[PDB]
Amino acid sequence: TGDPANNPLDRVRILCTDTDNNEILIDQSVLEWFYQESGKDEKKAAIKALKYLLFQVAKMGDEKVGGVYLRNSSRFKSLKAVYDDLVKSSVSGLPYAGGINQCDIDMRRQNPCSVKKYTEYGDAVRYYG
Amino acid sequence: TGDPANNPLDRVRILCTDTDNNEILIDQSVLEWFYQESGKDEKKAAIKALKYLLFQVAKMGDEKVGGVYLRNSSRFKSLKAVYDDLVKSSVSGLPYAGGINQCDIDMRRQNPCSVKKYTEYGDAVRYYGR
Amino acid sequence: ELTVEAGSRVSLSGYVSDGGTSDVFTICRLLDAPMNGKSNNCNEIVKIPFDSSCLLGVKLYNCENKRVNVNSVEAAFITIDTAFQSPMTVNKESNRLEYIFSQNDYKVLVKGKVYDMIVNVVDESGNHSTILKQKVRFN
Amino acid sequence: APMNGKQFISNNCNEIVKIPFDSSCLLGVKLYNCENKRVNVNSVEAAFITIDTAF
Amino acid sequence: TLTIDGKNKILATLTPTTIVLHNVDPTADPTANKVTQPVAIFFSEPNNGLIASEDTVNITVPASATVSHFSLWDDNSKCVATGALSSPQFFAEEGIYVISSVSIDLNK
Amino acid sequence: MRLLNRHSFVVKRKVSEDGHYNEDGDWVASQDVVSINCKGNIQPYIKGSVKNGTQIVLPEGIRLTDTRILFTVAELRTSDDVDWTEADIVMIKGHEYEVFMTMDWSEQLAHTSHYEYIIIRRDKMNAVRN
16 A cells, blocks of 8 residues: 555565556455455465465466456466575474484473383483383 | 665665565565564565565466556566575575584484494494494 | 976956946756646756856746746745755746855755755745745755 | 546545645645536534544 | 976965955066955865866956056065956946956966 | 556546537537546557647648557546537646547456547637536
């Protein structure tokens, strides 16, 4: 709508990169719903909107009414490449290796519904097994 | 625009390659928004601007209104290829490599949350073993 | 076996009194000023040669689309951003709001910076109003 | 301001009104009746302008 | 030949301050035919070996005088430049001669 | 960046569609004309007889006429003798234009439905009221 400083909804547009006002693909009513369900949090609202944008772009087809032409075919191919690169191919947490943390080790030993191994690391220099 | 020497926003436009008023792509309202969020630092604003620019070019399709015909399907591919070569593939840090620095090892030897290794390098030449 | 020379030249010009108000003429810049608000596109940059002395020509278009005389307004101020604030001249004869730049103004300017020209007009009923918001570059 | 709700020319999006800051400006509203005919302002005894969260 | 940087430092020491008008050329003697009285004239900083005054100078020419020459004078009271007036002006009555632009330069 | 909304003009529509004939017999146009900005693409109309920006050397002077095509999504009307409509005036560079002839692709497609208009510059004429 032009103002990103004092409009939460338009901030969603910036993150969802629909700041065109000439080829609008995500209607404000749809955008308002995404904002409402996403606890009025813009960041987790864009992700929902961005996925919705991908669906709309894919369904669109090549149109030619006399005088005006519009090739929508080569948009998803371009859009997907950005989406995977900048959104999907971006980890949101920490990985997990095996026995690299004793505190983790003890915490996992408290679980009763777990198999009991015969020999474990460390059971060669422990007085009380 | 047109004053890179005294206008912070003008400098940002140069770094984001949107210095063409005929076919402006990132609106000044959006660009001002990015500038403020990146603590009024031009370099980080350009990075976000470029990523935003990549999104816009992808969504742009061909249009033919009467006499004019603008083909936009070959603009992303060229832009994408430049992006990885010049931006996405520019390491700006140090690659960690095993245990070399006798220093880092001692700092990592103090962390309580670890595993008591049976033996490590440089163990049998020291009296006070571990 | 070597000698470098030079020369001198002096020039003068007088216009013997005549008891008038001189004949000051040096400018080309004249600007629009719709009171209703003007293809938006991107506004052009007014370019004044640094130094020299331009005469800003502001034409008051009344707020339908018509030229209006410089009436009501009793004070006009040019307020180029963070540079200076000086009053303008309400010219009855030419029916324009004009201001000439002097050498003093350029002492607080830098060659190249794109300042913003804001023009305020105050009528009898003390109502400040911004008329123009053009951008100027002193190249 | 058409009072019948219907836009003059539809399919056209509205434009955000831009007023310079620190400038006394006079807002002008011209009312049109249900037949899109300019009304005379003797039909309104009082009117109020809302700026949502300003005044 | 001199350079621009050389010429600018030269003109930075003139500082002419007063101007007096003559009827005949002073050249040989600047102390003769002092038709008018010294009146303050302000110059500018050198630019490419050229200095120009900022504003017009109103010289109070006495009545029954024919002004046709021109010679500068600095703060030290020793004339540094002389020139013509490009036209002999005869003030039959007491008038107000006005100079529009003075320019001393060394670009040949 | 739709090409369909590149240019922006101001249209005068005779909103108060009255257009009655006075008792004397002359024509009294609508007294209420509004001017609201629209958006569209204005291109020269190149088709045979139609002349664009052509000076006509009459034995009375030199008259200038032109004909532009207008692609837009707005429903601009034209003078109609059944609904008592009175055309629309487009403006380019100040000069008034008239919307003669219309093509109505309003419902056909989804994202490409548009109107095509043929706008003609109005000739210079002395104005008398009635």
